[PDB]
Amino acid sequence: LWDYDFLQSLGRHSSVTEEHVGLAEKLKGEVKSLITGPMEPLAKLEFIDSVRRLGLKYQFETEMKEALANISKDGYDSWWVDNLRATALRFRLLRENGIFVPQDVFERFQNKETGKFKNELCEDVKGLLNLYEASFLGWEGEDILDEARTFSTAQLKNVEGKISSPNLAKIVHHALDLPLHWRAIRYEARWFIDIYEDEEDMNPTLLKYAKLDFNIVQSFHQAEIGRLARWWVGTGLDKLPFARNGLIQSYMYAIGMLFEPHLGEVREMEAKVGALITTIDDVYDVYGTMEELELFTDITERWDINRVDQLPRNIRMPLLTMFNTSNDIGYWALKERGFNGIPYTAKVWADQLKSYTKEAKWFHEGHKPTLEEYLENALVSIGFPNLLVTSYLLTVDNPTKEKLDYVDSLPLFVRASCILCRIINDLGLKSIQCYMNETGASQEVAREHIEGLVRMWWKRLNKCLFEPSPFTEPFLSFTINVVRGSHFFYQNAESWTKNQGMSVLIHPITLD
Numbered sequence: 161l162w163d164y165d166f167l168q169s170l171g172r173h174s175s176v177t178e179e180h181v182g183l184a185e186k187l188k189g190e191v192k193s194l195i196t197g198p199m200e201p202l203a204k205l206e207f208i209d210s211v212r213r214l215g216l217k218y219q220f221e222t223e224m225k226e227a228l229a230n231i232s233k234d235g236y237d238s239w240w241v242d243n244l245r246a247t248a249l250r251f252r253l254l255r256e257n258g259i260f261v262p263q264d265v266f267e268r269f270q271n272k273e274t275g276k277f278k279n280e281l282c283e284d285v286k287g288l289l290n291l292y293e294a295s296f297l298g299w300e301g302e303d304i305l306d307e308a309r310t311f312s313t314a315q316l317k318n319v320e321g322k323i324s325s326p327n328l329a330k331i332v333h334h335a336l337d338l339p340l341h342w343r344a345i346r347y348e349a350r351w352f353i354d355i356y357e358d359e360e361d362m363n364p365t366l367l368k369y370a371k372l373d374f375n376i377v378q379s380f381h382q383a384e385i386g387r388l389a390r391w392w393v394g395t396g397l398d399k400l401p402f403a404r405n406g407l408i409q410s411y412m413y414a415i416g417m418l419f420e421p422h423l424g425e426v427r428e429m430e431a432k433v434g435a436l437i438t439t440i441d442d443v444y445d446v447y448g449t450m451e452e453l454e455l456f457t458d459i460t461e462r463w464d465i466n467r468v469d470q471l472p473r474n475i476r477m478p479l480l481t482m483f484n485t486s487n488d489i490g491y492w493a494l495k496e497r498g499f500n501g502i503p504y505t506a507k508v509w510a511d512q513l514k515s516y517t518k519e520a521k522w523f524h525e526g527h528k529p530t531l532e533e534y535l536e537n538a539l540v541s542i543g544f545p546n547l548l549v550t551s552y553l554l555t556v557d558n559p560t561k562e563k564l565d566y567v568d569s570l571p572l573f574v575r576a577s578c579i580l581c582r583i584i585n586d587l588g589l590k591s592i593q594c595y596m597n598e599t600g601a602s603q604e605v606a607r608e609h610i611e612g613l614v615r616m617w618w619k620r621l622n623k624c625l626f627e628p629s630p631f632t633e634p635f636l637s638f639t640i641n642v643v644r645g646s647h648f649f650y651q652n653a654e655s656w657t658k659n660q661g662m663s664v665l666i667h668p669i670t671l672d
């Protein structure tokens with residue numbers, strides 16, 4: 161996975177035929193019919209959840225929303241009322257699909273005195289699991305869902321080792337590591353294909369479609385990786401001391417942000433930006449002198465490369481690649497979207513290098529920022545304002561200066577995502593140490609505080625998605641999915657990473 165000879169040859173061929181593609185068109189039609197067609201409502205919720213978890217929401221979003229809307233406007237509730245598993249699955253799938261369900265659907269499962277969940281639930285594994293997964297769709301002040309999380313976490317930890325079904329035990333272990341709401345879609349799809357195949361409820365048409373679609377999508381990723389590896393070797397940044405494997409790390413993160421084939425060009429551009437972010441992060445952290453870094457920053461602020469030959473080669477090359485790629489991406493927006501994006505790529509790079517320079521000056525002067533002071537800068541230095549403003553530039557319908565100026569100002573929805581990506585990275589001049597310095601907290605207490613900030617910012621993202629937004633798809637999804645990418649990659653670590661890379665990007669799923 162780390163060999164550019166091997167990567168640069170990916171895309172050359174694929175074992176995905178026109179026969180595979182026709183078969184895929186036929187299976188898609190039956191799955192679409194299964195989602196729209198008759199089924200008992202609990203079975204339909206479980207089917208739609210399986211479609212999502214197999215990575216296929218992008219193929220059936222309209223059918224799934226229509227089916228859930230039907231179910232939501234029912235009037236007949238006997239199928240779910242008094243059933244924890246049914247109540248919790250309904251609550252989750254409706255909230256995920258923009259249909260509001262109040263937290264009070266769970267009040268009947270509580271002790272009316274203490275507000276604690278009933279002891280009699282402690283044995284219901286599938287109920288606890290659905291309640292756990294449901295809890296992460298909660299908003300600020302939804303106290304029943306905060307209790308549901310703490311209760312279902314404690315109970316699932318308790319019962320995990322008591323489960324008889326191996327498949328169910330693996331699912332519970334997976335959930336305790338990360339809830340489904342926090343998992344990167346493409347990576348979870350590869351994991352869940354093998355789990356689903358072993359489920360007793362398993363639908364073989366849906367399994368077969370999931371394997372075939374997985375392989376077809378993966379052939380697009382392999383062509384992208386080819387083009388990106390050839391680009392990267394073209395830049396000569398593969399040969400620089402630092403950011404060993406930056407390209408493939410960037411691309412693997414990009415796949416968490418957006419995996420769909422129709423977003424290939426956008427994904428390649430995000431991946432280039434990410435490769436440069438990680439490369440230049442090393443320049444500012446390890447390699448450059450303060451004078452070199454100040455010049456790098458000043459050149460970028462003025463978007464004026466007159467003085468670039470004052471920098472040494474190993475710094476000039478990253479700078480000019482950043483400049484050239486930013487111009488290319490802004491130009492793509494002009495050619496493809498009618499809107500010159502260079503002012504916006506130049507601006508987010510200037511902002512990011514300013515945030516690196518501030519970190520470098522803090523380090524050099526031995527400054528201890530407050531957690532708030534650190535995060536105000538570190539939500540920029542993490543690179544997600546740069547990555548998200550770029551993704552908006554490339555995907556927004558009818559781009560305008562007004563629209564770009566708004567997204568670039570980092571309203572709550574966007575800022576929440578950036579802060580989350582930063583604090584998740586730090587949990588993986590750092591969040592925990594800053595909070596320790598500010599309050600005298602222990603590492604253990606400081607870590608729990610930062611963890612509570614993750615849960616808080618997630619509740620704000622969740623609520624922002626039920627609110628009318630000036631944003632549309634795919635940007636709404638990008639903002640959530642960069643956070644999932646962060647969770648996934650900040651839980652050998654390199655053996656785990658390579659397996660993820662090999663199973664998701666390199667090896668097709670065996671079809672019979």
Ligand SMILES: CC(C)=CCC/C(C)=C/CC/C(C)=C/CSP(=O)(O)OP(=O)(O)O
Pocket residue numbers: 409410411413414417430431434435437438441445542543547585642645
């Ligand atoms: C979504 C997408 C298109 C790609 C994202 C690309 C990447 C890799 C972005 C994350 C930024 C990182 C990991 C830089 C170091 S964080 P740090 O400086 O706090 O940590 P360090 O001290 O360098 O380990």
